[PDB]
Amino acid sequence: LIQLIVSGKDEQSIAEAIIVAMVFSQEDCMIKAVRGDLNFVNRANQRLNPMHQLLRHFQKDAKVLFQNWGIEPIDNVMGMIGILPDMTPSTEMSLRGVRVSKMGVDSTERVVVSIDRFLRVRD
Amino acid sequence: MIIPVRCFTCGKIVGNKWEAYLGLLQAEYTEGDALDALGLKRYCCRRMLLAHVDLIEKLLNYAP
Amino acid sequence: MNAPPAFESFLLFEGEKKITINKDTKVPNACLFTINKEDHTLGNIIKSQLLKDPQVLFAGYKVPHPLEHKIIIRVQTTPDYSPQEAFTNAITDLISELSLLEERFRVAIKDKQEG
Amino acid sequence: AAAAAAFAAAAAAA
Amino acid sequence: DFSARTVITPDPNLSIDQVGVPRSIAANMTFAEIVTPFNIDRLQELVRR
Amino acid sequence: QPMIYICGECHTENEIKSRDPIRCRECGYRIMYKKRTKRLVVFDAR
Amino acid sequence: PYANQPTVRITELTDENVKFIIENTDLAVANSIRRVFIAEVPIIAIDWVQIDANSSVLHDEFIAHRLGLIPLTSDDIVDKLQYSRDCTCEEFCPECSVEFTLDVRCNEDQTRHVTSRDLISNSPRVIPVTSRNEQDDILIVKLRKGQELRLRAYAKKGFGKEHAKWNPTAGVAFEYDPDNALRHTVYPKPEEWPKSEYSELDEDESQAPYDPNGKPERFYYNVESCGSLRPETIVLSALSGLKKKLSDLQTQLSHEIQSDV
Amino acid sequence: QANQKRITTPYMTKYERARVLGTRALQIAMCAPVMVELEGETDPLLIAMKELKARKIPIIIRRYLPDGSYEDWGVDELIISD
RNA sequence: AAGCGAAACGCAGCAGACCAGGC
Ligand SMILES: [Mg+2]
Ligand SMILES: [Zn+2]
Ligand SMILES: [Zn+2]
Ligand SMILES: [Zn+2]
């Protein structure tokens, strides 16, 4: 994860968005953060989607992931506030590549596109 | 009040040299020859053995 | 009352980065490497190894304050080269030199013990 | 600027 | 109030306009800073600290 | 209440209680010293 | 634009000191190696004491601080032990520490010399230098009839930057250019100065001629060990330590180059 | 006093500058409106200082004379030296 | 995507002498 700027409405929402972003990153520090009883095969032994299992596990408990993700210094920038593993915002420290914006972030729009013979969609 | 363990300057052990140093002086040795026999070549360790005062020996004259 | 812990010179505090790279805007192809929890032991060897690279125009190190345990290394190179690349090669070169010095020391020790 | 999130399959953290 | 005193020491690594203040004196003395949307964040974190 | 104090010369752990005169029951000395605590007192060799 | 090809020539090797010479290397590498010998070579030493009883004339901090300065044999154990900061145990486990014990009481009328011999360790590999099978035993404290000293110490792995007790050297005689050819020094009266043991000049001469194309080479060394680590183990552990520091720095560097984008 | 003929110096004194920056900094600290741009300025001192360099401070200095009269000189009418 | 037993609770000072010492 190079950078992430969240603009959640609530602290709980901020935590949920960060967890989703960390899981989507697939960073090794998050895979190693998996702890306790997590199964990637159901009772029928079918193979579940690992991303969904990780997302569910980390949404159930994110304390370990936040603790092991890592911390970095914050470059003072107007409107950007860091966030710490204990969820309390900070101005000097923050999670690695994580920022919180209080002014909002911009929005859905459909764009016409051209598709060639080999199904390669281009703008 | 008791001989230090290491030399403050270099770090050479001197705590095991005090009793031996006194043991040489009573044997009619000169302070310089005694310090040479103990292997103290640098003037920093020689400073440690030649300028020390065993005050603990006087503190033990008082009942505990 | 204020004696700073001794381990504070070498252990990295929680969330503090070991090295930060800042591009110098005064002249082109220059950078500042701010390394935390280090001293003249690495700054001098890296400086000297950088001076030997002819593609390096400037190589110096400084300690902003002796009480602090950080160090700043400035590196300026030619346009065809890069300061990060010079700092990387300089570390690789020092590693090879120490590896070689270690093997030749083990050999010298063996030759001296066997006589 | 309240907005939806399309498909979703997640619960709340603790 | 809001004063201090201790022994001085040389420090060539400081500018002429700088003074090296220990962490103890700096921790006991304080400055009443007014709250604004520009510093509400920093001051908040410092209060919770 | 149970104070196993020490005497200056006689060094006896006489159980001197409160509301009493400090006096060694074995030799009569008037000066008493307390015994080392039982708490775990550690020390970093630095 | 590359490294050098240094050589080594050992002129004296004993159990107390080692005298060697490094050629074809930069002054920075030679000085950093000298600094590592004193400050970045791991060694085992006492760093935790629990005084259970001390009736001696020396207070507790005086005894604890003394005990820390006692050298402990750490030739092959220091590479296996770990630092308490990285160890995933608590208290003082056998993988990150070595337990010591002392129980002495002066029952006789003669003064009892509490020495390092009385320090009983759980590991036979880590023991006081003087206790290793001449040299006398280190003196901790003298006791009078009726006095007692009983404690339970723990040794840890550390280096010189944390405390001088973790310094395995008793002097590092670093020298280069015995004959002042590079003129790094300027003797106002060169005839009044003595000749170094590594000098190669006639007594009629005071210093070698100036060499403009000269560079610092042929660095001389004399690593006198305290006794804990053999004189050669200090040098090997030093070069390995400095190479590890550079390897870790290169790792953090690559992590910062990659983190850029 | 007749504002058409003000005899005081046209430059702002070091004391007038000190008190102007101080009072304006206090105002900004009390969430008062800012007149100039604030690209990366939050500390009220740096804001008041940029406002002085920009000459956009809404303050009038009432210079009292010994006779009892006074001359009201605005921060925009005075020439800043330092 | 997944899925099982299908009430009530952060103190406090003498003061005033005199002596020694600090840059
Ligand atoms: Mg003075
Ligand atoms: Zn010495
Ligand atoms: Zn008695
Ligand atoms: Zn351990």
Automatic annotation (TrEMBL), chain B:
Keyword Metal-binding part of the UniProt annotation: yes
SUPFAM superfamilies referenced in this protein's UniProt entry, alphabetically: RNA polymerase subunit RPB10
Binding-site residues for Zn(2+), renumbered to this chain: 7, 10, 44-45
A Gene Ontology cellular-component term: RNA polymerase II, core complex
Listed GO MF terms: DNA binding; DNA-directed RNA polymerase activity; zinc ion binding
Broad class of the protein's primary localization: nucleus
Keywords noted in UniProt: DNA-directed RNA polymerase, Metal-binding, Transcription, Zinc
Locations listed in the record: Nucleus
GO biological process terms held by the UniProt record: DNA-templated transcription
Protein purpose: DNA-dependent RNA polymerase catalyzes the transcription of DNA into RNA using the four ribonucleoside triphosphates as substrates. Common component of RNA polymerases I, II and III which synthesize ribosomal RNA precursors, mRNA precursors and many functional non-coding RNAs, and a small RNAs, such as 5S rRNA and tRNAs, respectively.
PANTHER family: DNA-DIRECTED RNA POLYMERASES I, II, AND III SUBUNIT RPABC5 (PTHR23431:SF11), DNA-DIRECTED RNA POLYMERASES I, II, AND III SUBUNIT RPABC5 FAMILY MEMBER (PTHR23431)
Family: Belongs to the archaeal Rpo10/eukaryotic RPB10 RNA polymerase subunit family.
Protein known as: DNA-directed RNA polymerases I, II, and III subunit RPABC5
UniProtKB/TrEMBL annotation, chain E:
Location in or out of the cell: Chromosome; Cytoplasm; Nucleus
Family, similarity comment: Belongs to the RNA polymerase beta' chain family.
Its biological purpose: RNA-dependent RNA polymerase that catalyzes the extension of a non-coding RNA (ncRNA) at the 3'-end using the four ribonucleoside triphosphates as substrates. An internal ncRNA sequence near the 3'-end serves as a template in a single-round Pol II-mediated RNA polymerization reaction. May decrease the stability of ncRNAs that repress Pol II-mediated gene transcription.
Name recorded for this polypeptide: DNA-directed RNA polymerase subunit
Gene: POLR2A
Range within the parent protein: 360 to 408 of 1968
Automatic annotation (TrEMBL), chain F:
High-level lineage: Eukaryota, Metazoa, Chordata, Craniata, Vertebrata
Annotated GO MF terms: DNA binding; DNA-directed RNA polymerase activity; zinc ion binding
SS bond list: 7-24, 7-27, 10-27, 24-27
Compartment(s) where it occurs, according to its Swiss-Prot or TrEMBL record: Nucleus, Nucleolus
Source organism (scientific name): Sus scrofa (Pig)
Residues that, per the record, bind Zn(2+) 5: 26
Keyword Transcription attributed: yes
Listed name of the protein: DNA-directed RNA polymerases I, II, and III subunit RPABC4
General function of this protein: DNA-dependent RNA polymerase catalyzes the transcription of DNA into RNA using the four ribonucleoside triphosphates as substrates. Common component of RNA polymerases I, II and III which synthesize ribosomal RNA precursors, mRNA precursors and many functional non-coding RNAs, and a small RNAs, such as 5S rRNA and tRNAs, respectively.
Binding, Zn(2+) 1: 7, 10, 24, 26-27
Protein family according to the UniProt entry: Belongs to the archaeal Rpo12/eukaryotic RPC10 RNA polymerase subunit family.
Tree of life domain: Eukaryota
Residue numbers binding Zn(2+) 3: 24
Keyword Metal-binding among UniProt keywords: yes
From TrEMBL, chain H:
Residues of the full protein shown: 46 to 127 of 127
Role played: DNA-dependent RNA polymerase catalyzes the transcription of DNA into RNA using the four ribonucleoside triphosphates as substrates. Common component of RNA polymerases I, II, and III which synthesize ribosomal RNA precursors, mRNA precursors and many functional non-coding RNAs, and small RNAs, such as 5S rRNA and tRNAs, respectively. Pol II is the central component of the basal RNA polymerase II transcription machinery. Pols are composed of mobile elements that move relative to each other.
Alphabetic keyword roster: DNA-directed RNA polymerase, Nucleus, Transcription
Superkingdom classification of source: Eukaryota
Subcellular location: Nucleus
Official protein name in the record: DNA-directed RNA polymerases I, II, and III subunit RPABC2
A GO BP annotation: transcription by RNA polymerase II
Similarity field: Belongs to the archaeal Rpo6/eukaryotic RPB6 RNA polymerase subunit family.
Gene Ontology cellular-component annotations: fibrillar center; RNA polymerase I complex; RNA polymerase II, core complex; RNA polymerase III complex
GO molecular function, one term: DNA-directed RNA polymerase activity
